[PDB]
Design an enzyme around this catalytic site. Structure first.
Site, mmCIF file in Angstrom:
data_model
loop_
_atom_site.group_PDB
_atom_site.id
_atom_site.type_symbol
_atom_site.label_atom_id
_atom_site.label_comp_id
_atom_site.label_asym_id
_atom_site.label_seq_id
_atom_site.Cartn_x
_atom_site.Cartn_y
_atom_site.Cartn_z
ATOM 1 N N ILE A 56 -45.080 -9.096 23.937
ATOM 2 C CA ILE A 56 -46.181 -8.191 23.645
ATOM 3 C C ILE A 56 -47.346 -9.019 23.102
ATOM 4 O O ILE A 56 -48.467 -8.931 23.620
ATOM 5 C CB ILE A 56 -45.777 -6.980 22.773
ATOM 6 C CG1 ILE A 56 -44.605 -6.183 23.404
ATOM 7 C CG2 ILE A 56 -46.981 -6.091 22.468
ATOM 8 C CD1 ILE A 56 -44.784 -5.691 24.855
ATOM 9 N N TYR A 67 -46.437 -11.480 11.362
ATOM 10 C CA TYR A 67 -45.320 -12.279 10.836
ATOM 11 C C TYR A 67 -44.509 -13.055 11.874
ATOM 12 O O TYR A 67 -43.668 -13.886 11.518
ATOM 13 C CB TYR A 67 -44.426 -11.421 9.919
ATOM 14 C CG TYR A 67 -45.228 -10.667 8.883
ATOM 15 C CD1 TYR A 67 -45.788 -11.325 7.792
ATOM 16 C CD2 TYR A 67 -45.498 -9.311 9.036
ATOM 17 C CE1 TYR A 67 -46.579 -10.647 6.867
ATOM 18 C CE2 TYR A 67 -46.289 -8.624 8.121
ATOM 19 C CZ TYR A 67 -46.817 -9.292 7.030
ATOM 20 O OH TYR A 67 -47.598 -8.617 6.127
ATOM 21 N N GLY A 68 -44.805 -12.808 13.140
ATOM 22 C CA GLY A 68 -44.152 -13.460 14.255
ATOM 23 C C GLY A 68 -44.467 -12.800 15.572
ATOM 24 O O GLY A 68 -45.220 -11.822 15.632
ATOM 25 N N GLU A 115 -38.299 0.634 17.109
ATOM 26 C CA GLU A 115 -38.577 1.563 18.191
ATOM 27 C C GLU A 115 -39.730 0.964 19.036
ATOM 28 O O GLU A 115 -40.636 0.325 18.488
ATOM 29 C CB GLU A 115 -39.003 2.894 17.568
ATOM 30 C CG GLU A 115 -39.599 3.918 18.503
ATOM 31 C CD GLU A 115 -40.263 5.076 17.793
ATOM 32 O OE1 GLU A 115 -40.350 5.056 16.544
ATOM 33 O OE2 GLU A 115 -40.758 5.979 18.502
ATOM 34 N N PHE A 116 -39.665 1.147 20.375
ATOM 35 C CA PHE A 116 -40.720 0.656 21.255
ATOM 36 C C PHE A 116 -41.660 1.799 21.696
ATOM 37 O O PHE A 116 -41.187 2.878 22.109
ATOM 38 C CB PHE A 116 -40.101 0.029 22.513
ATOM 39 C CG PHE A 116 -41.096 -0.486 23.516
ATOM 40 C CD1 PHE A 116 -41.718 -1.721 23.336
ATOM 41 C CD2 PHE A 116 -41.421 0.261 24.654
ATOM 42 C CE1 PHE A 116 -42.667 -2.182 24.256
ATOM 43 C CE2 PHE A 116 -42.380 -0.194 25.550
ATOM 44 C CZ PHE A 116 -42.982 -1.419 25.354
ATOM 45 N N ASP A 156 -52.046 -3.273 5.783
ATOM 46 C CA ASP A 156 -52.707 -3.938 6.907
ATOM 47 C C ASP A 156 -52.912 -3.074 8.142
ATOM 48 O O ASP A 156 -52.632 -3.494 9.282
ATOM 49 C CB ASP A 156 -52.098 -5.320 7.190
ATOM 50 C CG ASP A 156 -52.911 -6.202 8.111
ATOM 51 O OD1 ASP A 156 -54.168 -6.070 8.119
ATOM 52 O OD2 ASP A 156 -52.300 -6.987 8.861
ATOM 53 N N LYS A 200 -54.630 -1.438 11.237
ATOM 54 C CA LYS A 200 -55.617 -1.914 12.194
ATOM 55 C C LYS A 200 -55.177 -1.329 13.540
ATOM 56 O O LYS A 200 -54.008 -0.927 13.700
ATOM 57 C CB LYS A 200 -55.665 -3.472 12.238
ATOM 58 C CG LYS A 200 -54.323 -4.141 12.531
ATOM 59 C CD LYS A 200 -54.423 -5.633 12.252
ATOM 60 C CE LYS A 200 -53.081 -6.315 12.184
ATOM 61 N NZ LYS A 200 -53.202 -7.653 11.533
ATOM 62 N N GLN A 214 -54.197 -2.600 16.276
ATOM 63 C CA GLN A 214 -53.033 -3.331 16.790
ATOM 64 C C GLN A 214 -51.708 -2.776 16.204
ATOM 65 O O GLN A 214 -50.623 -2.953 16.806
ATOM 66 C CB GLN A 214 -53.194 -4.833 16.468
ATOM 67 C CG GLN A 214 -54.354 -5.526 17.213
ATOM 68 C CD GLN A 214 -55.773 -5.278 16.705
ATOM 69 O OE1 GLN A 214 -56.040 -4.635 15.673
ATOM 70 N NE2 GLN A 214 -56.743 -5.799 17.443
ATOM 71 N N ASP A 274 -45.220 -1.616 11.550
ATOM 72 C CA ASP A 274 -45.143 -2.720 10.563
ATOM 73 C C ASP A 274 -45.413 -2.220 9.128
ATOM 74 O O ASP A 274 -45.948 -2.925 8.289
ATOM 75 C CB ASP A 274 -46.065 -3.883 10.974
ATOM 76 C CG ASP A 274 -45.445 -4.895 11.909
ATOM 77 O OD1 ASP A 274 -44.261 -4.731 12.262
ATOM 78 O OD2 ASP A 274 -46.139 -5.858 12.281
HETATM 79 N N1 LIG Z 1 -48.927 -5.504 25.828
HETATM 80 C C1 LIG Z 1 -50.028 -5.616 25.079
HETATM 81 N N2 LIG Z 1 -50.438 -6.834 24.742
HETATM 82 N N3 LIG Z 1 -50.750 -4.545 24.692
HETATM 83 S S1 LIG Z 1 -50.258 -3.030 24.956
HETATM 84 O O1 LIG Z 1 -51.282 -2.059 24.472
HETATM 85 O O2 LIG Z 1 -49.804 -2.765 26.362
HETATM 86 C C2 LIG Z 1 -48.890 -2.867 23.909
HETATM 87 C C3 LIG Z 1 -47.633 -2.474 24.399
HETATM 88 C C4 LIG Z 1 -46.593 -2.323 23.471
HETATM 89 C C5 LIG Z 1 -46.761 -2.576 22.101
HETATM 90 N N4 LIG Z 1 -45.732 -2.386 21.252
HETATM 91 C C6 LIG Z 1 -45.653 -2.916 20.019
HETATM 92 C C7 LIG Z 1 -44.614 -2.600 19.134
HETATM 93 C C8 LIG Z 1 -43.653 -1.613 19.367
HETATM 94 O O3 LIG Z 1 -43.497 -1.072 20.471
HETATM 95 N N5 LIG Z 1 -42.917 -1.407 18.271
HETATM 96 C C9 LIG Z 1 -43.398 -2.221 17.277
HETATM 97 C C10 LIG Z 1 -43.000 -2.362 15.945
HETATM 98 C C11 LIG Z 1 -43.636 -3.310 15.115
HETATM 99 C C12 LIG Z 1 -44.728 -4.040 15.625
HETATM 100 C C13 LIG Z 1 -45.130 -3.907 16.962
HETATM 101 C C14 LIG Z 1 -44.489 -2.957 17.773
HETATM 102 C C15 LIG Z 1 -48.044 -2.914 21.623
HETATM 103 C C16 LIG Z 1 -49.095 -3.088 22.541
#
Ligand SMILES: N=C(N)NS(=O)(=O)c1ccc(N/C=C2\C(=O)Nc3ccccc32)cc1
Ligand code: NA
Length: 279
Positions: A10, A15-16, A72-73, A118, A120, A122, A136
């Site tokens: 991703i 933190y990583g 969770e994704f 934090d 944002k 992202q 996070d």
């Molecule tokens: N793939 C990129 N770079 N951007 S995107 O918008 O398609 C995108 C796709 C998936 C994610 N998922 C991030 C995360 C996620 O699913 N679960 C998390 C728990 C902690 C931190 C990050 C995540 C974040 C961004």
């Protein structure tokens, strides 16, 4: 870790590196983050902090003196959605639904004395159903970084900051959804502070009692006059401007809580629209 197959990088989190991965035992698709005893206990407490607007922390894996967090994704973050909606703008009912849902998530965490610290775009994740979730959450207490959403009290050196820091960040995000541009895109701590002061006025003892005694406060800061919110966030209506103004109060004690923000008249007509998502 051998129970997981990496699928997609991703990107570089705080933190990583965060990876999309598959659990070989269940078939579950997850987000895997590769990161002291104090950290293990704080992280483990976050496993209990469950809410529909908080990305679920599934597991904590401590192996070979390394830490992996399994979450969770969700398929997209708010940064990509805002970039994808730049020409058109995110519809106001959807901005309102997202702000309401994030305020629900913050009211929950804050009621458990847990801060994000934090927020944002992202770390705000969205799905096809119209949900938005805080990712996070609590990791900052547990363990280039963007300064755009940092509260002024952090920038002025407050070491014991409050839940109000998350309301500030969320107010900055709200303004950015509305205008399609970052509110305060500072590229250094002083540039960040000065961008805040140029819009909201240089804070003084009148608006923020105790501000002149803060660690990084300098009497030599330039004195800028405050701007109207009508100039800052057009074409946002007065309910939205009034809420935003309360989320951007300088004094953390004056700043609206997430619980009180949920009762704001801006949310009288809140709905849950479904976003136009291309995955
Ligand atoms: N793939 C990129 N770079 N951007 S995107 O918008 O398609 C995108 C796709 C998936 C994610 N998922 C991030 C995360 C996620 O699913 N679960 C998390 C728990 C902690 C931190 C990050 C995540 C974040 C961004
Ligand atoms: Na959780």
């Amino acid at each position: 870790m051998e129970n997981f197959q990496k699928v997609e990088k991703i990107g570089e989190g705080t933190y990583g590196v965060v990876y999309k991965a598959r659990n070989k035992l269940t078939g579950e698709v997850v987000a895997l983050k590769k990161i002291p005893s104090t950290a293990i206990r704080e992280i483990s407490l976050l496993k209990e902090l469950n809410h529909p607007n908080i990305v679920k922390l599934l597991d904590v894996i401590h192996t070979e003196n390394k830490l992996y967090l399994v979450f969770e994704f969700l398929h997209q973050d708010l940064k990509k959605f805002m970039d994808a909606s730049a020409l058109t703008g995110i519809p106001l009912p959807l901005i309102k639904s997202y702000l309401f849902q994030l305020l629900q998530g913050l009211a929950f965490c804050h009621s458990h004395r847990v801060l994000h610290r934090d927020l944002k775009p992202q770390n705000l994740l969205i799905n096809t159903e119209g949900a938005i979730k805080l990712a996070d959450f609590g990791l900052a207490r547990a363990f280039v970084v963007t300064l755009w959403y940092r509260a002024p009290e952090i920038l002025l050196g407050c070491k014991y900051y409050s839940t109000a820091v998350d309301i500030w960040s969320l107010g900055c995000i709200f303004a950015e959804m509305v205008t399609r541009r970052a509110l305060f895109p500072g590229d250094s701590e002083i540039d960040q502070l000065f961008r805040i002061f140029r819009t909201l006025g240089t804070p003084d003892e009148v608006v923020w009692p105790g501000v002149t005694s803060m660690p990084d406060y300098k009497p030599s800061f330039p004195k800028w006059a405050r701007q109207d919110f009508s100039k800052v966030v057009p074409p946002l209506d007065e309910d939205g401007r009034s809420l935003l103004s309360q989320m951007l109060h300088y004094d953390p004690n004056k700043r609206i809580s997430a619980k009180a923000a949920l009762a704001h008249p801006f949310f009288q007509d809140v709905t849950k629209p479904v976003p136009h998502l291309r995955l």
